[PDB]
């Protein structure tokens, strides 16, 4: 099961990836996670990515492709894999198509999670993450028992640095522009499948399961 999740910022890719992971046991390769790890450790790759991430811009293709190429250089990815947030440009997708052809591991499905932009903005600006355990909540859609605090550990919830309104607006603008031709690319390859992301989490995942059930 060689799967790409795509969707505009806030579409719920990470939420669905966690479920896909737990059910099918394929590795979750998240560029967003990998960049945030590098940023937090202040590595040279981290500091390079940060200038872009903090503005809501894409990290250049050169470094991104190269970190993904080799993440996929691993024995855990022979089962299959779940790419979350890569590719997000046609040039990324074309690099990935080549690499995977050579690797014998071409993409089965690209699952595109579709959510109205108004809701996307609400999802991102209202997201709150536990500073203690990393659990994600949402002010409206999945609120804590006590506002501002994690149910599990009493930890303070915070808003991610790139989830303020102005950075969200930039992130949507950047990704809307790149998503248009990327979807055309994967549709021409006949691997694109759309899913309605504006359902409860369990129902979105139910639709994902129908798609992937055939690849168990
Ligand atoms: N390939 C690449 N090339 C270049 N640069 C790259 C790159 N990949 C990354 N980058 C760089 O790294 C940066 C960060 O990357 P990235 O994190 O990949 O940005 P993303 O696509 O903007 O959107 P998020 O990933 O923030 O959210 P998500 O869609 O996973 O949503 P979640 O599941 O949390 O859910 C969102 C919220 O909604 C809630 N929620 C989720 N599902 C539902 C639902 N079904 N109903 C109600 N609420 C829900 C959640 O609780 C949560 O509060 C990029 O901006 C770019 O700078
Ligand atoms: Zn917590």
UniProtKB/Swiss-Prot annotation:
Main location group: cytoplasm
Organism in which the protein naturally occurs: Bacillus subtilis (strain 168)
Protein name: Adenylate kinase
Reactions catalysed: AMP + ATP = 2 ADP
EC number: 2.7.4.3
Binding site for ATP: 10-15, 127, 136-137, 199
Assigned keywords, A-Z: ATP-binding, Cytoplasm, Kinase, Metal-binding, Nucleotide biosynthesis, Nucleotide-binding, Transferase, Zinc
One GO MF term attached to the UniProt entry: ATP binding
Temperature characteristics of this protein: Optimum temperature is 45 degrees Celsius. Thermal denaturation midpoint (Tm) is 47.6 degrees Celsius and is raised to 66.0 degrees Celsius when AK is complexed with the inhibitor Ap5A.
Membrane-crossing residue ranges in chain numbering: none
Gene3D superfamilies tied to this protein: P-loop containing nucleotide triphosphate hydrolases
UniProt free text on domains: Consists of three domains, a large central CORE domain and two small peripheral domains, NMPbind and LID, which undergo movements during catalysis. The LID domain closes over the site of phosphoryl transfer upon ATP binding. Assembling and dissambling the active center during each catalytic cycle provides an effective means to prevent ATP hydrolysis. Some bacteria have evolved a zinc-coordinating structure that stabilizes the LID domain.
Domain of life the protein comes from: Bacteria
Pathways per UniProt: Purine metabolism; AMP biosynthesis via salvage pathway; AMP from ADP: step 1/1
Segments for region (LID): 126-163
Positions annotated to bind AMP: 31, 36, 57-59, 85-88, 92, 160, 171
General function of this protein: Catalyzes the reversible transfer of the terminal phosphate group between ATP and AMP. Plays an important role in cellular energy homeostasis and in adenine nucleotide metabolism.
Cell compartments where the protein resides: Cytoplasm
Induction text: By superoxide.
Family: Belongs to the adenylate kinase family.
Any Gene Ontology biological process: nucleoside monophosphate metabolic process
């Amino acid at each position: 099961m060689n799967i790409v999740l795509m969707g505009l910022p806030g579409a719920g890719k990470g939420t669905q990836a966690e479920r896909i992971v737990e059910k099918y046991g394929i590795p979750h390769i998240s560029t967003g996670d990998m960049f945030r790890a590098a940023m937090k450790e202040e590595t040279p790759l981290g500091l390079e990515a940060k200038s872009y991430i903090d503005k809501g811009e894409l990290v250049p293709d050169e470094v991104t492709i190269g970190i993904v190429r080799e993440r996929l250089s691993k024995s855990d990815c022979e089962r299959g894999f779940l790419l979350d947030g890569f590719p997000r440009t046609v040039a990324q997708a074309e690099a990935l198509e080549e690499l995977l052809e050579e690797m014998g591991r071409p993409i089965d499905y690209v699952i595109n999670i579709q959510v109205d932009k108004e809701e996307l903005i609400a999802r991102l600006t209202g997201r709150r993450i536990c500073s203690v355990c990393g659990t994600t909540y949402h002010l409206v859609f999945n609120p804590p028992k006590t506002p501002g605090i994690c149910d599990k550990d009493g930890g303070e919830l915070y808003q991610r640095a790139d989830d303020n309104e102005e950075t969200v607006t930039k992130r949507l603008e950047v990704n809307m522009k790149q998503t248009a031709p990327l979807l055309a690319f994967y549709d021409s390859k006949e691997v694109l499948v759309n899913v309605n992301g504006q359902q409860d989490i369990q129902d979105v995942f139910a639709d994902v399961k129908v798609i992937l059930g055939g690849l168990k």
